[PDB]
Amino acid sequence: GGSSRHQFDLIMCLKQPGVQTGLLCEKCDGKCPICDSYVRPKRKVRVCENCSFGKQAKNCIICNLNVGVNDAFYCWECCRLGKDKDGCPRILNLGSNRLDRHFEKKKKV
Numbered sequence: 001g002g003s004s005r006h007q008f009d010l011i012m013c014l015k016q017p018g019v020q021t022g023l024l025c026e027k028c029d030g031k032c033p034i035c036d037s038y039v040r041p042k043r044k045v046r047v048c049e050n051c052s053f054g055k056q057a058k059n060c061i062i063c064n065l066n067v068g069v070n071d072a073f074y075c076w077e078c079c080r081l082g083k084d085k086d087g088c089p090r091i092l093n094l095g096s097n098r099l100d101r102h103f104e105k106k107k108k109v
């Protein structure tokens with residue numbers, strides 16, 4: 001099941017997490033970086049030092065643009081599966097289309 005056109009394309013940084021916690025902008029607030037399903041959290045996401053000392057530290061990890069306000073938490077489901085154990089949860093895949101394929105009269109995000 002899966003391993004095809006159900007990837008989600010969660011291309012994330014996945015390096016070695018540092019001390020700096022991954023911040024979410026209110027627009028991605030509540031979203032689990034690994035899956036995005038507004039489900040029970042568990043542990044604050046740690047961004048890799050490469051990102052911490054790489055300018056992209058305070059800015060939201062999910063939409064890597066707007067500054068983050070709340071630390072992201074890995075959802076229990078991702079923790080159970082063991083996706084969080086990979087590393088830095090910075091979403092890289094997101095160049096545009098914050099979610100799905102709709103801006104719907106909201107600039108783009």
Ligand SMILES: [Zn+2]
Binds near residue numbers: 076077
């Ligand atoms: Zn998750």
Ligand SMILES: [Zn+2]
Binds near residue numbers: 013050
């Ligand atoms: Zn990183």
Ligand SMILES: [Zn+2]
Binds near residue numbers: 026027028063064066
């Ligand atoms: Zn965001």
